[PDB]
Amino acid sequence: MQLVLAAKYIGAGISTIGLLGAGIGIAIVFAALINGVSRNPSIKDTVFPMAILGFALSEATGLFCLMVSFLLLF
Amino acid sequence: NDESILLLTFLGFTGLVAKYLAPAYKDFADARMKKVSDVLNASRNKHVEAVKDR
């Protein structure tokens, strides 16, 4: 019983890197966003809310990752 | 048996071989055979047509 909280701690340790994908995901949105704009410069109004839409509910996976990490931390 | 199951798959497989590849292989050999026989007949035809020139 003095190990199940220790196992919660180490399971919170390797619940961490599910947002690893978030770390290498939402970022490339901006990569394509620059290729969205530096190719065709008159399109900022079309794609910048489109890119924040693509950002938010792709980061949401990293949110889900670390919130299961927090509730397995506690 | 364990290996008569591979015999079952092998019977169906060689049946599908004789379904798909072996008629295509047969008519591929037909195409090559017609090509070789036609050019070999045409070479001798031009050869025998050349003898009349003299």
Partner: protein
């Protein structure tokens, strides 16, 4: 164990196919090659 038996018959057949293919079966087909060539080339 029996590495010698498979190695023995396998090397005998490797030497067999080397000498056999070389002196027999490749030039029996190259016969057909040069035959069709000196019929068509004439």
């Amino acid at each position: 164990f029996y590495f010698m038996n498979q190695l023995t018959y396998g090397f005998l057949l490797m030497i067999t196919l080397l000498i056999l293919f070389s002196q027999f079966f490749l030039p029996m087909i190259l016969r057909l090659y040069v035959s069709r060539l000196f019929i068509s080339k004439l």
